Amino acid sequence: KEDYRERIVNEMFDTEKSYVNSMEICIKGYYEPLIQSGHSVAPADKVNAVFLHFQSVLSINKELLKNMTELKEKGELSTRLGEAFSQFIPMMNVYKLFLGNSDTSLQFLVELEKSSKFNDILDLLRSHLPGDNQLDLRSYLIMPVQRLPRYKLLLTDLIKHTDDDFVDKPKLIDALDKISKLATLVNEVIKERSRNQKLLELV
Amino acid sequence: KEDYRERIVNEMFDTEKSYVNSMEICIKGYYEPLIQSGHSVAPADKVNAVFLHFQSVLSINKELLKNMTELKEKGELSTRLGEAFSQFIPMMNVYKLFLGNSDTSLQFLVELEKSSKFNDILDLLRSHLPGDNQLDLRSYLIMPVQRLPRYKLLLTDLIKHTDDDFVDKPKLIDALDKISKLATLVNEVIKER
Numbered sequence: 001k002e003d004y005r006e007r008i009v010n011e012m013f014d015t016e017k018s019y020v021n022s023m024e025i026c027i028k029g030y031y032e033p034l035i036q037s038g039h040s041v042a043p044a045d046k047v048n049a050v051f052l053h054f055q056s057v058l059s060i061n062k063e064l065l066k067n068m069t070e071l072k073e074k075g076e077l078s079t080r081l082g083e084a085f086s087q088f089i090p091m092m093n094v095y096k097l098f099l100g101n102s103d104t105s106l107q108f109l110v111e112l113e114k115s116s117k118f119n120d121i122l123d124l125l126r127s128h129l130p131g132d133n134q135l136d137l138r139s140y141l142i143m144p145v146q147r148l149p150r151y152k153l154l155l156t157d158l159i160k161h162t163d164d165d166f167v168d169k170p171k172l173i174d175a176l177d178k179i180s181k182l183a184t185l186v187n188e189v190i191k192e193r194s195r196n197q198k199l200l201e202l203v
Numbered sequence: 204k205e206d207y208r209e210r211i212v213n214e215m216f217d218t219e220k221s222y223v224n225s226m227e228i229c230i231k232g233y234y235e236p237l238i239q240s241g242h243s244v245a246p247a248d249k250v251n252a253v254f255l256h257f258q259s260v261l262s263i264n265k266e267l268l269k270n271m272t273e274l275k276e277k278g279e280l281s282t283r284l285g286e287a288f289s290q291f292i293p294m295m296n297v298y299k300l301f302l303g304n305s306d307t308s309l310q311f312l313v314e315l316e317k318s319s320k321f322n323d324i325l326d327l328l329r330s331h332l333p334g335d336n337q338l339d340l341r342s343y344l345i346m347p348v349q350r351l352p353r354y355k356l357l358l359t360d361l362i363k364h365t366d367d368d369f370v371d372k373p374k375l376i377d378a379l380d381k382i383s384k385l386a387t388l389v390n391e392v393i394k395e396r
Contacts, residue, residue: 001394001396003316003322004394007339010339014335014336017335018335018336021335113206132217132220132221132224133217133221136210136213138210197207199204200204
């Protein structure tokens with residue numbers, strides 16, 4: 001049914017805007033302050049290894065949102081959404097690199113986070129984030145990791161509800177095919193879990 | 204490990220405020236306009252069967268947030284959160300009633316939603332829902348149904364990370380025990396036809 005379909009389309013759009021907006025707030029709010037200042041317990045190399053490949057994800061997602069926004073204001077998003085994805089999907093390797101750095105990124109965060117002074121700086125930077133949703137760093141760094149499975153979810157349900165008479169349908173299928181290829185998120189979730197909880201018992 | 208714990212505490216608090224705030228926006232923004240406007244295509248009985256037991260959930264959750272907020276400003280939420288739950292968990296039966304009505308609520312929504320005029324009213328009301336995330340109706344009506352599992356999640360993780368020297372620990376255990384009882388009822392429903 002058309003109106004169920006519309007909902008999914010709107011959810012994807014609304015969670016994308018949300019996602020890109022959050023990402024810009026982590027760059028503007030955390031990354032940039034660290035690279036400008038608070039230098040002592042937060043060396044640039046440590047900070048950069050933490051954020052490596054994040055602007056890269058923001059970049060391609062911001063372009064995806066742009067095209068999605070272009071279509072929506074023209075009242076043609078339901079019918080050409082897979083057009084927006086066709087520019088996006090082949091830029092995905094960025095997601096591979098980001099995912100690929102998550103183990104390292106987290107190892108450096110946890111090392112930094114031994115410093116009490118460092119923690120205070122981070123808590124300070126957070127208190128300057130806009131909105132009521134002032135999330136901690138991890139809660140931003142994880143978002144690219146979380147996006148992919150949501151795409152899978154969203155696109156699966158949208159395809160199931162898209163007739164073959166939609167010209168856009170193959171474009172959605174291509175997208176789900178390539179997005180699904182990044183099912184290694186589970187490996188990433190697992191390894192992030194272990195590192196975060198390694199030192200319940202001892203180290 | 205203490206700082207992992209702090210996170211969960213803060214997530215619960217932040218998702219509660221979010222939750223109660225969303226709920227007030229559904230009452231103020233959808234329910235109240237429908238009941239005042241008295242549209243032919245949205246009669247009170249239909250509307251009320253749809254929203255039945257929702258204000259009741261808002262009420263007890265708003266009191267939970269109150270107490271959580273009281274504790275936070277006093278810098279003592281980490282350590283007395285299960286105190287806040289102590290007033291809440293026994294008021295849960297309203298969650299039973301709300302859950303219990305979901306089949307009916309949704310049946311009436313889907314019947315209403317045959318009317319093109321009805322859908323336009325709803326889309327109009329939404330346009331006036333505040334903020335970027337002006338959600339549709341079902342996205343509000345489902346939130347109580349989603350809350351319970353998150354409590355279970357969050358409390359399970361918080362207990363696991365709370366040593367026995369915390370005086371509040373039994374209070375968290377009580378809560379998980381009773382919330383678990385209601386989370387048994389949480390299942391899925393069909394996109395038939």
